[PDB]
Structures are given as C-alpha cells and as structure tokens.
Amino acid sequence: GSMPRVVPDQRSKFENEEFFRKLSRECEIKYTGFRDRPHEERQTRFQNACRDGRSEIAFVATGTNLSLQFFPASWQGEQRQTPSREYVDLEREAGKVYLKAPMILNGVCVIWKGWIDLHRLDGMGCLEFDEERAQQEDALAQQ
C-alpha cells in the first residue's frame, strides 16, 4: 500500500527471510570482486574499492555472493565522504579492516557487518538490523 523499500514487519522479516538466514549471525565471509587479481595490489585496492562506495562480498557458510552497498542514508557513490570507522575506511586495522553496510533487500534495513582480514580478503561477517535506517526508510516511504 504505497510503501516499497520497506516491509511492515521489518524486524520479523530480518529473521524470516531465507536470504538473511543464510548470511546468519557472526560467520565466515570472503570478498568477491577485483580481489580475483593476483596478490600485491589487491590488498590496497580492496580498501580503495571499499572506499569507492558499493562493492561485492560473499559468505562462506551458505556461500551467498551479494553486492554490498556502502550507501548510508545520505547516498554518495563519490568515493566516501564521512561515514563511521566500521562503516568504511578506518586507517587500517590489525592486518584486517572492518566493514558495515546497511542493505535494503526485501524492504528490511539490515546491517551487513564484518571484518575482512587482509590476508586474501577473506574473514568474518554477518547481518544485524539497522533500527534507525528501518525507521528512516519507513519515513522515506513518503510517510
């Protein structure tokens, strides 16, 4: 009823949807992109592609390749403005980086989160709910 980009029961859909359930809580993940290059460059390029904005990252647990969307409620695309540490680009963590990208799959503002270790750009991540974006997107549904 004139409210896409959201569902009513967002917080139930977060736990209902097979898509989110396959990504689950804290599991193992891998990058899936320009990382398919040889090693040397792909480590720095990885944090540059993370800084571009959107990217593509997969899981291990179900092996769900998804397009990550480093687009906060102010969308940018112009190679990062000023997001969080954990969101994008945090001066570089302990041989890893932390990443955090709210997705709007079904009409659930989830958070995809994780750390991708720099070793090959594989690591750990999962979903959470974005309890603010869900409210904001419910507003932005011309409410």
Which residues on adjacent β-strands are paired with residue 129?
A: 110
Q: What is the DSSP string of the chain?
A: ----S--SSHHHHHHH-HHHHHH-SSEEEEE-SGGGSPTTTHHHHHHHHHHHS---EEESSS---B------SS---SS--S--TTTS--S--SSEEEEEEEEESSS-EEEEEEEEETTTTEEEEEEEE-HHHHHHHHHHTT-
Contact yes or no for 115/124 (Cβ under 8 A): yes
Which method was used?
A: NMR
* Pairwise CA distance, residues 133 & 24, whole Å: 20
Contact yes or no for 101/111 (Cβ under 8 A): yes
Contact yes or no for 105/19 (Cβ under 8 A): yes
* Pairwise CA distance, residues 3 & 107, whole Å: 9
* Pairwise CA distance, residues 96 & 78, whole Å: 24
- CATH architecture assignment, domain 1-143: Beta Barrel (2.40)
Contact yes or no for 14/40 (Cβ under 8 A): no
Strands 109-117 vs 122-129: parallel, antiparallel or unpaired: antiparallel
